Amino acid sequence: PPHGELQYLGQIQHILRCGVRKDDRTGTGTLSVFGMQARYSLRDEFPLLTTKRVFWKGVLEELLWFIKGSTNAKELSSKGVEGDLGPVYGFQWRHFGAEYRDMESDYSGQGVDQLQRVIDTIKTNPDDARIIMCAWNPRDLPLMALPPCHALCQFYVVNSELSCQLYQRSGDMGLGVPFNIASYALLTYMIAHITGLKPGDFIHTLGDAHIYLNHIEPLKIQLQREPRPFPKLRILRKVEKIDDFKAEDFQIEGYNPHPTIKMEM
Amino acid sequence: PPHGELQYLGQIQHILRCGVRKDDRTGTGTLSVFGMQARYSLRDEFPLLTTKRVFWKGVLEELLWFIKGSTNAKELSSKGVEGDLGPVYGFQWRHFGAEYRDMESDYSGQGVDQLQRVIDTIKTNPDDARIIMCAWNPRDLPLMALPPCHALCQFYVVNSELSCQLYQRSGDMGLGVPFNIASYALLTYMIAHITGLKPGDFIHTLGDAHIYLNHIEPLKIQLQREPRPFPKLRILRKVEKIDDFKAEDFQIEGYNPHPTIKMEM
C-alpha cells in the first residue's frame, strides 16, 4: 500500500512535465493543469507532508482562528503566526450571509452557522448528501451579484467513519496545497471527534492546479526526497463543542520530515 | 492511449468490489464510494458511452430545454422525450436568484444569467478562475436558508481550448452518470463554439458515487463489453448566440454502441 504523499509528488511531476504556461490575475507566470484529485487516509495516521517540514503550528492556530469566526489579524499574530481583515473565511463559516460591519461588532445569532450546521446534520442524518459548507474569496463579494464560491467542503459518513472532500477552484501546488491538506484533514479530525465518529478519508480536488515559476527549482529538489511514514494526530481531551477546542488539545506524534523548503510567496 | 470509457468501467468495478452499503433518502439501497474523478478528451471525439446505447436525442433535447430556461414539462415531451416543473435547472441557469412565479410568467432581465455570464467571462478574461455556474435541487430551496448547491460546472481556457469540470455532490453511476457525461460534454462543445474556442477536456468529479442494488446485475454484464472508439460530434452551422442552437444543428457521427441496457429508475 503506497504512501499517500506519492500522489502529491506525482501531481507535481505531472504539472512540471505536462502543465501549460498560464498567467494568474497578478500576471505572475504558472505551469497549469485543470482537474486533479488525491485521497489521503485519515485512519490511524495524519497527512502532514514529510518531503518538507510543514508549519504545523500555523495550520493549527489558523484553523482555530477560523472556527472562532474572527476577523482580527492581531488575534492570529499574537499566537505567533488595523487588524481588521474583512469577511474572511471564519466569518463566512460561522455567520454566512450576514452583512459584515466591524471586527468588534457582535454577530451572535446572525447569519447561517455553516460549521455548526454540518455538525448538526451529521448528528441528525449522517446519510444526507447535503453536508456541505462553502467559502468565498472576500475580494469577489463586491465584484458582482452572487459570485461563485472559492472552495467547498462536502462531508460523508459510512460505517461510523467521517470523510471530507475539499474542492478548490484553484490551488497553489507548491505553497498552498500541503498546508491545506493538513488544515482540512485537521478539520475532519475535529468534526469526527465532536460527532463521535472516526476519521475516514480526506479527498482533495482541484480545478486549476498550478505551480508558480519560481517554485519549479525547489519542487524539483523536493521530488528527489522519499516520504517518511505519516505521523499520527492525538486529541488529548474529550471535547463536546467545536468552539471548545484549543491548540493544547492536539498532539502530533512521530513527525519526521525532510528539511524546510522556502517557496517565495 | 487507452479508451476514455475504461475509466467509467473501472469506477463501476471499483464500487462493486469495494463500495459500502448505504441507503439513499428514499431508503433504497446502494453500494457507495466517496470521491471520484474521470477525464474525457473532447479533442476530435465526443464521449457518448459505447458499452450501452445512450439516448442521445434525450440528452440533446433536454440540454436545449435547460438553455431556454423553461419550466414547462410539455415543452420537453413534445420533442419526444400541469406541466409546471418549478424552478428547475434551466430557470436557475438563466434566472439565478429570481423569485419563481409561473412557468408562463415573464422573467426577462430577472435574476443572474449564469450561463451568459460564463460565456461573457470567457470572452473578457479567459484566464479568470471564477468561470463557474451552479445548480440546486429544487426540493432543497424551501428546506433551509442558503442550501448548498447540487452541482457546479467550472470552465477553464488555455491554448484556445475550453475545458469543463462538473462536480456533483452525488452521482447515480448506472443511470445518471453516462447521461451527464454526454450532457456536459455537449454543453462544453456549445460554449466552445460560441466563444471561438476548441473543446479540450471534460472532467467529471463526484462526492457520493453510488450504484443502486438493482443495477448490479446489468452493470456486471456491461463490464464484459469492450468499448468501441468514441463517435464525433459535428456542429453543422455557424452559431453566434447560445440561445440560437437547435437540435438540427448537431450531428453525431460514427456512434457504434453495444445494445441498450435497461436500468430500473
Short mmCIF file of all heavy atoms in Angstrom, two decimals, chain A residues 20 22 32 34-37 39 96 117 127 129-130 139-140 143-146 148 154 156-159 165 167 169 203 205-206, chain B residues 20 22 32 34-37 39 96 117 129-130 139-140 143-146 148 154 156-159 165 167 169 203 205-206:
data_model
loop_
_atom_site.label_atom_id
_atom_site.label_comp_id
_atom_site.label_asym_id
_atom_site.label_seq_id
_atom_site.Cartn_x
_atom_site.Cartn_y
_atom_site.Cartn_z
N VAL A 20 0.75 23.55 -18.71
CA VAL A 20 0.85 24.60 -19.73
C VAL A 20 1.09 25.96 -19.06
O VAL A 20 0.57 26.23 -17.98
CB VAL A 20 -0.46 24.68 -20.56
CG1 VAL A 20 -0.37 25.78 -21.60
CG2 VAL A 20 -0.75 23.34 -21.25
N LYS A 22 0.54 29.57 -18.03
CA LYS A 22 -0.68 30.34 -17.83
C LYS A 22 -0.45 31.39 -16.75
O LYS A 22 0.16 31.10 -15.71
CB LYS A 22 -1.82 29.39 -17.44
CG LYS A 22 -3.18 30.06 -17.30
CD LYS A 22 -4.28 29.05 -16.94
CE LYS A 22 -5.64 29.60 -17.38
NZ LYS A 22 -6.75 29.15 -16.52
N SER A 32 0.30 25.06 -15.47
CA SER A 32 -1.06 24.74 -15.04
C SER A 32 -1.66 23.47 -15.66
O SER A 32 -1.42 23.16 -16.83
CB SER A 32 -1.98 25.94 -15.31
OG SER A 32 -3.35 25.60 -15.12
N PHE A 34 -5.65 21.41 -15.43
CA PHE A 34 -7.02 21.56 -14.94
C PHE A 34 -7.61 20.21 -14.53
O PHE A 34 -7.62 19.27 -15.33
CB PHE A 34 -7.89 22.24 -16.01
CG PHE A 34 -9.31 22.54 -15.56
CD1 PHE A 34 -9.56 23.40 -14.49
CD2 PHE A 34 -10.39 21.98 -16.23
CE1 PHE A 34 -10.87 23.69 -14.09
CE2 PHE A 34 -11.70 22.26 -15.83
CZ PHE A 34 -11.94 23.11 -14.76
N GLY A 35 -8.09 20.11 -13.29
CA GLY A 35 -8.74 18.89 -12.83
C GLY A 35 -7.72 17.94 -12.20
O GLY A 35 -6.97 17.27 -12.91
N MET A 36 -7.69 17.89 -10.87
CA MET A 36 -6.88 16.90 -10.16
C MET A 36 -7.61 16.39 -8.93
O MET A 36 -8.53 17.05 -8.44
CB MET A 36 -5.56 17.51 -9.68
CG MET A 36 -4.53 17.75 -10.76
SD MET A 36 -2.91 18.09 -10.02
CE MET A 36 -1.92 17.51 -11.39
N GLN A 37 -7.20 15.23 -8.43
CA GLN A 37 -7.80 14.67 -7.22
C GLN A 37 -6.80 13.74 -6.55
O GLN A 37 -6.05 13.06 -7.23
CB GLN A 37 -9.09 13.89 -7.55
CG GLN A 37 -9.92 13.49 -6.31
CD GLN A 37 -11.25 12.83 -6.67
OE1 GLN A 37 -11.31 11.63 -6.94
NE2 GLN A 37 -12.32 13.63 -6.68
N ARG A 39 -6.48 11.21 -2.67
CA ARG A 39 -7.18 10.69 -1.48
C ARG A 39 -6.16 10.37 -0.39
O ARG A 39 -5.22 9.59 -0.61
CB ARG A 39 -7.98 9.41 -1.82
CG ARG A 39 -8.56 8.65 -0.60
CD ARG A 39 -9.27 7.34 -1.03
NE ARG A 39 -10.14 7.63 -2.15
CZ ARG A 39 -11.44 7.90 -2.05
NH1 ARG A 39 -12.06 7.84 -0.87
NH2 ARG A 39 -12.12 8.20 -3.14
N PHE A 96 -22.49 33.10 7.86
CA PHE A 96 -22.76 33.11 6.42
C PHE A 96 -23.97 33.95 6.05
O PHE A 96 -25.09 33.72 6.53
CB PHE A 96 -22.99 31.66 5.96
CG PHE A 96 -23.19 31.51 4.48
CD1 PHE A 96 -22.58 32.38 3.58
CD2 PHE A 96 -24.01 30.50 3.98
CE1 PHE A 96 -22.78 32.24 2.22
CE2 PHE A 96 -24.21 30.35 2.62
CZ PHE A 96 -23.60 31.22 1.74
N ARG A 117 -23.95 23.75 11.35
CA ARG A 117 -24.99 23.05 10.59
C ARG A 117 -24.49 21.71 10.05
O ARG A 117 -25.22 20.72 10.07
CB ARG A 117 -25.55 23.92 9.46
CG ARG A 117 -26.64 23.24 8.66
CD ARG A 117 -27.40 24.22 7.79
NE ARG A 117 -26.63 24.67 6.63
CZ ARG A 117 -27.06 25.58 5.75
NH1 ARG A 117 -28.26 26.13 5.92
NH2 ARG A 117 -26.31 25.93 4.72
N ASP A 127 -26.54 10.14 6.59
CA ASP A 127 -26.62 9.76 5.17
C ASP A 127 -26.88 10.92 4.22
O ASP A 127 -26.76 10.76 3.00
CB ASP A 127 -27.71 8.70 4.95
CG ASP A 127 -27.41 7.40 5.66
OD1 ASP A 127 -26.22 7.01 5.70
OD2 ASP A 127 -28.35 6.76 6.17
N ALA A 129 -26.83 13.85 1.72
CA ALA A 129 -25.84 14.22 0.72
C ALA A 129 -25.60 15.72 0.67
O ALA A 129 -24.83 16.20 -0.16
CB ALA A 129 -26.24 13.70 -0.66
N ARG A 130 -26.24 16.47 1.57
CA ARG A 130 -26.13 17.93 1.58
C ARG A 130 -25.22 18.47 2.69
O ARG A 130 -25.34 19.63 3.08
CB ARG A 130 -27.51 18.58 1.70
CG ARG A 130 -28.47 18.24 0.58
CD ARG A 130 -29.90 18.68 0.91
NE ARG A 130 -30.38 17.99 2.11
CZ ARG A 130 -31.61 17.54 2.27
NH1 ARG A 130 -32.51 17.69 1.31
NH2 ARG A 130 -31.95 16.92 3.40
N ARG A 139 -12.55 39.27 -1.81
CA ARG A 139 -12.46 40.25 -2.89
C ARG A 139 -13.56 40.06 -3.94
O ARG A 139 -13.96 41.02 -4.60
CB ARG A 139 -11.08 40.24 -3.54
CG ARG A 139 -10.67 38.89 -4.11
CD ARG A 139 -9.23 38.95 -4.61
NE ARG A 139 -9.00 40.18 -5.35
CZ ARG A 139 -9.23 40.32 -6.65
NH1 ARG A 139 -9.68 39.29 -7.35
NH2 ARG A 139 -8.99 41.48 -7.24
N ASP A 140 -14.07 38.84 -4.08
CA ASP A 140 -15.15 38.57 -5.02
C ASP A 140 -16.50 39.19 -4.64
O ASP A 140 -17.32 39.48 -5.51
CB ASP A 140 -15.34 37.06 -5.23
CG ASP A 140 -14.15 36.42 -5.91
OD1 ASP A 140 -13.31 37.16 -6.45
OD2 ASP A 140 -14.07 35.17 -5.90
N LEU A 143 -17.73 42.39 -6.27
CA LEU A 143 -17.46 42.38 -7.71
C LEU A 143 -18.71 42.22 -8.57
O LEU A 143 -18.84 42.83 -9.62
CB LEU A 143 -16.48 41.27 -8.07
CG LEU A 143 -15.01 41.49 -7.71
CD1 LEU A 143 -14.15 40.42 -8.34
CD2 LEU A 143 -14.56 42.86 -8.17
N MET A 144 -19.62 41.37 -8.10
CA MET A 144 -20.79 41.01 -8.88
C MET A 144 -21.83 40.46 -7.93
O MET A 144 -21.51 40.08 -6.80
CB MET A 144 -20.42 39.93 -9.90
CG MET A 144 -20.07 38.59 -9.23
SD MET A 144 -19.25 37.38 -10.31
CE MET A 144 -17.57 38.01 -10.34
N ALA A 145 -23.07 40.41 -8.39
CA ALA A 145 -24.13 39.72 -7.66
C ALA A 145 -23.84 38.24 -7.69
O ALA A 145 -23.45 37.70 -8.72
CB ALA A 145 -25.48 40.02 -8.29
N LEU A 146 -24.04 37.59 -6.55
CA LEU A 146 -23.94 36.13 -6.44
C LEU A 146 -22.66 35.55 -7.04
O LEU A 146 -22.72 34.71 -7.94
CB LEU A 146 -25.18 35.49 -7.07
CG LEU A 146 -26.48 36.04 -6.48
CD1 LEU A 146 -27.72 35.39 -7.11
CD2 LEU A 146 -26.50 35.88 -4.97
N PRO A 148 -19.38 33.22 -7.54
CA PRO A 148 -19.21 31.81 -7.19
C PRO A 148 -18.26 31.65 -6.00
O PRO A 148 -17.44 32.54 -5.74
CB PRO A 148 -18.59 31.20 -8.46
CG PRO A 148 -17.89 32.34 -9.11
CD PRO A 148 -18.69 33.58 -8.78
N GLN A 154 -17.38 18.98 1.31
CA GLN A 154 -18.51 18.05 1.44
C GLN A 154 -18.10 16.93 2.38
O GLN A 154 -17.02 16.35 2.22
CB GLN A 154 -18.90 17.45 0.07
CG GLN A 154 -20.07 16.44 0.14
CD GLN A 154 -20.45 15.84 -1.23
OE1 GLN A 154 -19.92 16.24 -2.27
NE2 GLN A 154 -21.36 14.88 -1.22
N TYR A 156 -19.13 13.15 4.48
CA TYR A 156 -19.74 11.87 4.11
C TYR A 156 -19.50 10.92 5.27
O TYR A 156 -18.39 10.87 5.82
CB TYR A 156 -19.07 11.38 2.84
CG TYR A 156 -19.36 9.95 2.38
CD1 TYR A 156 -20.27 9.70 1.33
CD2 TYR A 156 -18.67 8.87 2.90
CE1 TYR A 156 -20.50 8.39 0.88
CE2 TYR A 156 -18.89 7.58 2.45
CZ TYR A 156 -19.80 7.35 1.45
OH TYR A 156 -19.98 6.07 1.02
N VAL A 157 -20.52 10.17 5.64
CA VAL A 157 -20.43 9.24 6.76
C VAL A 157 -20.84 7.85 6.32
O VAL A 157 -21.90 7.68 5.73
CB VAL A 157 -21.37 9.65 7.91
CG1 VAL A 157 -21.29 8.63 9.07
CG2 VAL A 157 -21.03 11.06 8.38
N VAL A 158 -20.02 6.86 6.63
CA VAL A 158 -20.41 5.48 6.43
C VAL A 158 -19.63 4.62 7.42
O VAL A 158 -18.48 4.94 7.75
CB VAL A 158 -20.19 5.02 4.98
CG1 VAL A 158 -18.75 4.57 4.76
CG2 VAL A 158 -21.18 3.91 4.61
N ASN A 159 -20.26 3.56 7.93
CA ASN A 159 -19.61 2.68 8.91
C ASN A 159 -18.92 3.43 10.06
O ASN A 159 -17.79 3.11 10.42
CB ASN A 159 -18.58 1.77 8.22
CG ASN A 159 -19.23 0.78 7.28
OD1 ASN A 159 -20.41 0.45 7.42
ND2 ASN A 159 -18.46 0.28 6.31
N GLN A 165 -14.44 15.94 1.49
CA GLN A 165 -13.87 16.30 0.19
C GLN A 165 -13.82 17.80 0.05
O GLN A 165 -14.85 18.48 0.12
CB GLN A 165 -14.66 15.71 -1.00
CG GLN A 165 -14.03 16.15 -2.34
CD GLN A 165 -14.52 15.38 -3.57
OE1 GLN A 165 -13.94 15.51 -4.65
NE2 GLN A 165 -15.57 14.57 -3.41
N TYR A 167 -13.12 20.79 -2.45
CA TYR A 167 -12.97 21.20 -3.85
C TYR A 167 -12.53 22.65 -3.86
O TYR A 167 -13.26 23.49 -3.38
CB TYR A 167 -14.29 21.06 -4.62
CG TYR A 167 -14.20 21.52 -6.08
CD1 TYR A 167 -14.09 20.59 -7.11
CD2 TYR A 167 -14.19 22.87 -6.42
CE1 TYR A 167 -13.99 20.99 -8.44
CE2 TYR A 167 -14.09 23.28 -7.76
CZ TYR A 167 -13.99 22.33 -8.76
OH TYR A 167 -13.89 22.71 -10.09
N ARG A 169 -11.38 25.82 -6.43
CA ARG A 169 -11.40 26.17 -7.86
C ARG A 169 -9.99 26.41 -8.40
O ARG A 169 -9.75 26.34 -9.61
CB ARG A 169 -12.29 27.38 -8.12
CG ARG A 169 -11.70 28.73 -7.62
CD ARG A 169 -12.75 29.83 -7.74
NE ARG A 169 -12.22 31.13 -7.31
CZ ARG A 169 -12.98 32.16 -6.95
NH1 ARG A 169 -14.30 32.06 -6.96
NH2 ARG A 169 -12.40 33.30 -6.59
N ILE A 203 -10.30 13.84 0.79
CA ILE A 203 -10.14 13.84 -0.67
C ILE A 203 -9.96 15.30 -1.10
O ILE A 203 -10.77 16.16 -0.75
CB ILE A 203 -11.38 13.27 -1.37
CG1 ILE A 203 -11.61 11.82 -0.92
CG2 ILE A 203 -11.22 13.32 -2.90
CD1 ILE A 203 -12.69 11.67 0.13
N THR A 205 -9.66 17.91 -4.20
CA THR A 205 -9.97 18.03 -5.63
C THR A 205 -9.70 19.46 -6.08
O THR A 205 -10.09 20.41 -5.38
CB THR A 205 -11.45 17.71 -5.90
OG1 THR A 205 -11.71 16.35 -5.53
CG2 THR A 205 -11.79 17.91 -7.37
N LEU A 206 -9.03 19.63 -7.23
CA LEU A 206 -8.70 20.97 -7.72
C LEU A 206 -9.27 21.24 -9.11
O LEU A 206 -9.39 20.31 -9.92
CB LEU A 206 -7.18 21.17 -7.78
CG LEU A 206 -6.41 21.26 -6.47
CD1 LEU A 206 -4.90 21.50 -6.71
CD2 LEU A 206 -7.00 22.35 -5.56
N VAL B 20 -19.43 0.45 -0.19
CA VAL B 20 -20.09 0.08 1.06
C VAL B 20 -21.60 0.26 0.93
O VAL B 20 -22.07 1.19 0.26
CB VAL B 20 -19.58 0.97 2.24
CG1 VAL B 20 -20.28 0.61 3.53
CG2 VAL B 20 -18.07 0.83 2.41
N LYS B 22 -25.11 1.55 1.59
CA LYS B 22 -25.58 2.83 2.11
C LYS B 22 -26.95 3.15 1.50
O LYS B 22 -27.15 2.96 0.30
CB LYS B 22 -24.56 3.93 1.76
CG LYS B 22 -24.89 5.30 2.33
CD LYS B 22 -23.81 6.34 1.98
CE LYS B 22 -23.85 7.47 3.01
NZ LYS B 22 -23.45 8.77 2.44
N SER B 32 -21.72 2.27 -2.28
CA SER B 32 -21.24 3.65 -2.34
C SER B 32 -19.74 3.82 -2.10
O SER B 32 -19.13 3.12 -1.28
CB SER B 32 -22.03 4.52 -1.36
OG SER B 32 -21.46 5.81 -1.22
N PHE B 34 -16.96 7.34 -1.83
CA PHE B 34 -16.92 8.81 -1.76
C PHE B 34 -15.67 9.36 -2.44
O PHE B 34 -14.55 8.96 -2.10
CB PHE B 34 -16.99 9.27 -0.29
CG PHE B 34 -17.07 10.77 -0.11
CD1 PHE B 34 -18.14 11.51 -0.63
CD2 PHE B 34 -16.08 11.45 0.59
CE1 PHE B 34 -18.21 12.89 -0.46
CE2 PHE B 34 -16.15 12.83 0.77
CZ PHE B 34 -17.21 13.55 0.24
N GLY B 35 -15.86 10.26 -3.41
CA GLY B 35 -14.73 10.90 -4.07
C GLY B 35 -14.31 10.10 -5.29
O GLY B 35 -13.64 9.08 -5.17
N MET B 36 -14.69 10.58 -6.48
CA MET B 36 -14.20 10.00 -7.74
C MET B 36 -13.95 11.09 -8.76
O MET B 36 -14.48 12.20 -8.64
CB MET B 36 -15.22 9.04 -8.33
CG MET B 36 -15.35 7.71 -7.63
SD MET B 36 -16.29 6.55 -8.65
CE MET B 36 -15.56 5.05 -8.00
N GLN B 37 -13.14 10.78 -9.77
CA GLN B 37 -12.86 11.73 -10.85
C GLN B 37 -12.47 10.98 -12.10
O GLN B 37 -11.80 9.95 -12.01
CB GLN B 37 -11.74 12.71 -10.45
CG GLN B 37 -11.56 13.90 -11.42
CD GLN B 37 -10.52 14.91 -10.94
OE1 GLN B 37 -9.32 14.73 -11.14
NE2 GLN B 37 -10.99 15.98 -10.28
N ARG B 39 -11.45 11.89 -16.53
CA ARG B 39 -11.19 12.93 -17.55
C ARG B 39 -11.48 12.38 -18.95
O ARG B 39 -10.92 11.35 -19.34
CB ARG B 39 -9.71 13.40 -17.49
CG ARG B 39 -9.26 14.32 -18.66
CD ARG B 39 -7.75 14.66 -18.56
NE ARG B 39 -7.45 15.07 -17.20
CZ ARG B 39 -7.41 16.32 -16.78
NH1 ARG B 39 -7.59 17.34 -17.63
NH2 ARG B 39 -7.18 16.56 -15.50
N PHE B 96 -31.02 32.99 -12.20
CA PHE B 96 -30.50 32.69 -10.87
C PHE B 96 -30.86 33.74 -9.83
O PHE B 96 -30.53 34.92 -9.99
CB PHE B 96 -28.97 32.56 -10.95
CG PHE B 96 -28.31 32.16 -9.65
CD1 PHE B 96 -28.97 31.35 -8.74
CD2 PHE B 96 -27.03 32.61 -9.35
CE1 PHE B 96 -28.36 31.00 -7.55
CE2 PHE B 96 -26.41 32.26 -8.16
CZ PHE B 96 -27.08 31.45 -7.26
N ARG B 117 -23.19 34.65 -18.35
CA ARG B 117 -22.06 35.24 -17.62
C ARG B 117 -20.77 34.43 -17.83
O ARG B 117 -19.70 35.00 -18.00
CB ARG B 117 -22.37 35.41 -16.14
CG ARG B 117 -21.22 36.04 -15.36
CD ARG B 117 -21.66 36.50 -13.98
NE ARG B 117 -21.89 35.40 -13.05
CZ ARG B 117 -22.34 35.56 -11.81
NH1 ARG B 117 -22.61 36.78 -11.36
NH2 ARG B 117 -22.52 34.51 -11.01
N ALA B 129 -10.36 32.53 -12.88
CA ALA B 129 -10.62 31.27 -12.19
C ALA B 129 -12.04 31.20 -11.64
O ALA B 129 -12.40 30.23 -10.98
CB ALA B 129 -9.61 31.06 -11.06
N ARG B 130 -12.86 32.21 -11.93
CA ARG B 130 -14.23 32.27 -11.42
C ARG B 130 -15.29 31.92 -12.46
O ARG B 130 -16.45 32.31 -12.32
CB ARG B 130 -14.53 33.66 -10.83
CG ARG B 130 -13.63 34.07 -9.68
CD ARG B 130 -13.80 35.55 -9.35
NE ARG B 130 -13.43 36.38 -10.50
CZ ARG B 130 -12.77 37.53 -10.43
NH1 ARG B 130 -12.39 38.00 -9.25
NH2 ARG B 130 -12.47 38.20 -11.53
N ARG B 139 -36.00 20.83 -4.60
CA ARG B 139 -36.58 20.44 -3.31
C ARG B 139 -35.81 21.02 -2.12
O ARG B 139 -36.38 21.24 -1.06
CB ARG B 139 -36.69 18.92 -3.20
CG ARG B 139 -35.38 18.18 -3.35
CD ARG B 139 -35.62 16.68 -3.35
NE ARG B 139 -36.57 16.32 -2.31
CZ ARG B 139 -36.22 16.04 -1.06
NH1 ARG B 139 -34.95 16.07 -0.70
NH2 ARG B 139 -37.16 15.72 -0.17
N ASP B 140 -34.52 21.31 -2.32
CA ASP B 140 -33.71 21.91 -1.26
C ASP B 140 -34.08 23.36 -0.92
O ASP B 140 -33.87 23.81 0.21
CB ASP B 140 -32.22 21.84 -1.60
CG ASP B 140 -31.70 20.42 -1.63
OD1 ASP B 140 -32.41 19.52 -1.14
OD2 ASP B 140 -30.57 20.21 -2.14
N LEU B 143 -36.19 24.21 2.11
CA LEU B 143 -35.80 23.41 3.27
C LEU B 143 -35.08 24.21 4.35
O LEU B 143 -35.27 23.99 5.54
CB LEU B 143 -34.90 22.25 2.84
CG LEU B 143 -35.57 21.07 2.15
CD1 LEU B 143 -34.60 19.92 2.02
CD2 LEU B 143 -36.79 20.63 2.93
N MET B 144 -34.23 25.13 3.91
CA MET B 144 -33.37 25.87 4.82
C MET B 144 -32.91 27.12 4.11
O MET B 144 -33.00 27.22 2.88
CB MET B 144 -32.14 25.02 5.16
CG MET B 144 -31.21 24.81 3.97
SD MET B 144 -29.96 23.52 4.17
CE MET B 144 -30.92 22.03 3.91
N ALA B 145 -32.42 28.08 4.88
CA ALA B 145 -31.77 29.25 4.32
C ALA B 145 -30.47 28.82 3.69
O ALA B 145 -29.74 28.01 4.25
CB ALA B 145 -31.51 30.29 5.40
N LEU B 146 -30.18 29.37 2.51
CA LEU B 146 -28.91 29.17 1.83
C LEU B 146 -28.49 27.70 1.72
O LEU B 146 -27.42 27.31 2.20
CB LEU B 146 -27.82 29.99 2.52
CG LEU B 146 -28.19 31.47 2.64
CD1 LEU B 146 -27.11 32.29 3.32
CD2 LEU B 146 -28.52 32.05 1.26
N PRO B 148 -26.98 24.25 0.21
CA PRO B 148 -25.84 24.07 -0.69
C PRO B 148 -26.30 23.64 -2.08
O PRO B 148 -27.40 23.08 -2.22
CB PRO B 148 -25.03 22.95 -0.01
CG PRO B 148 -26.04 22.18 0.77
CD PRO B 148 -27.09 23.17 1.21
N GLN B 154 -17.21 24.26 -13.55
CA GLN B 154 -16.14 25.24 -13.66
C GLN B 154 -15.50 25.10 -15.05
O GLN B 154 -15.18 23.99 -15.47
CB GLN B 154 -15.06 25.01 -12.58
CG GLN B 154 -13.87 26.00 -12.65
CD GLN B 154 -12.79 25.76 -11.58
OE1 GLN B 154 -12.95 24.92 -10.70
NE2 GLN B 154 -11.70 26.49 -11.67
N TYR B 156 -12.45 26.44 -17.98
CA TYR B 156 -11.02 26.73 -17.96
C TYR B 156 -10.57 26.84 -19.40
O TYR B 156 -10.97 26.04 -20.25
CB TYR B 156 -10.32 25.57 -17.26
CG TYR B 156 -8.79 25.51 -17.31
CD1 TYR B 156 -8.02 25.91 -16.22
CD2 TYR B 156 -8.14 24.95 -18.40
CE1 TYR B 156 -6.62 25.81 -16.25
CE2 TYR B 156 -6.75 24.85 -18.44
CZ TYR B 156 -6.01 25.27 -17.36
OH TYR B 156 -4.65 25.14 -17.43
N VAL B 157 -9.75 27.85 -19.69
CA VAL B 157 -9.28 28.09 -21.04
C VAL B 157 -7.76 28.15 -21.07
O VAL B 157 -7.16 28.87 -20.29
CB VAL B 157 -9.80 29.43 -21.59
CG1 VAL B 157 -9.24 29.70 -23.01
CG2 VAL B 157 -11.32 29.46 -21.57
N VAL B 158 -7.15 27.40 -21.97
CA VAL B 158 -5.72 27.54 -22.21
C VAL B 158 -5.44 27.11 -23.65
O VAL B 158 -6.12 26.22 -24.17
CB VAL B 158 -4.90 26.73 -21.19
CG1 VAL B 158 -4.76 25.28 -21.63
CG2 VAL B 158 -3.53 27.37 -20.99
N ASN B 159 -4.48 27.77 -24.30
CA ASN B 159 -4.14 27.45 -25.69
C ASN B 159 -5.35 27.34 -26.61
O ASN B 159 -5.45 26.41 -27.41
CB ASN B 159 -3.34 26.14 -25.76
CG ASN B 159 -1.97 26.27 -25.13
OD1 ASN B 159 -1.43 27.37 -25.00
ND2 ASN B 159 -1.40 25.14 -24.72
N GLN B 165 -15.19 21.31 -15.81
CA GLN B 165 -15.25 20.32 -14.72
C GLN B 165 -16.59 20.38 -14.04
O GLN B 165 -16.99 21.43 -13.52
CB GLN B 165 -14.14 20.53 -13.66
CG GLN B 165 -14.27 19.48 -12.53
CD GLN B 165 -13.05 19.37 -11.61
OE1 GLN B 165 -12.97 18.44 -10.81
NE2 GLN B 165 -12.11 20.31 -11.73
N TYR B 167 -18.71 19.11 -10.95
CA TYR B 167 -18.68 18.47 -9.62
C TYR B 167 -20.11 18.22 -9.20
O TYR B 167 -20.86 19.17 -9.06
CB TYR B 167 -17.99 19.38 -8.59
CG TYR B 167 -17.96 18.78 -7.18
CD1 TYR B 167 -16.82 18.19 -6.68
CD2 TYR B 167 -19.09 18.79 -6.37
CE1 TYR B 167 -16.79 17.63 -5.40
CE2 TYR B 167 -19.07 18.23 -5.08
CZ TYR B 167 -17.91 17.65 -4.61
OH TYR B 167 -17.86 17.09 -3.34
N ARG B 169 -22.48 16.53 -6.12
CA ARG B 169 -22.34 16.03 -4.74
C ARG B 169 -22.73 14.56 -4.63
O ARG B 169 -22.34 13.87 -3.68
CB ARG B 169 -23.15 16.89 -3.77
CG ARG B 169 -24.69 16.68 -3.87
CD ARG B 169 -25.42 17.72 -3.01
NE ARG B 169 -26.87 17.54 -3.06
CZ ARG B 169 -27.75 18.48 -2.73
NH1 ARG B 169 -27.33 19.68 -2.34
NH2 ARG B 169 -29.04 18.22 -2.78
N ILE B 203 -14.04 17.01 -17.32
CA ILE B 203 -13.62 16.30 -16.10
C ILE B 203 -14.86 16.13 -15.23
O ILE B 203 -15.57 17.10 -14.94
CB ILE B 203 -12.57 17.11 -15.32
CG1 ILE B 203 -11.33 17.34 -16.20
CG2 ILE B 203 -12.17 16.38 -14.03
CD1 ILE B 203 -11.27 18.71 -16.82
N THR B 205 -16.34 14.95 -11.63
CA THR B 205 -15.93 14.70 -10.25
C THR B 205 -17.16 14.43 -9.39
O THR B 205 -18.16 15.16 -9.51
CB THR B 205 -15.19 15.92 -9.67
OG1 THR B 205 -13.99 16.15 -10.43
CG2 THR B 205 -14.83 15.69 -8.21
N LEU B 206 -17.11 13.40 -8.55
CA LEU B 206 -18.27 13.05 -7.71
C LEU B 206 -17.93 13.07 -6.23
O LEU B 206 -16.80 12.77 -5.83
CB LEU B 206 -18.80 11.65 -8.06
CG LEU B 206 -19.48 11.46 -9.41
CD1 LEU B 206 -19.99 10.01 -9.59
CD2 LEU B 206 -20.63 12.46 -9.59
#
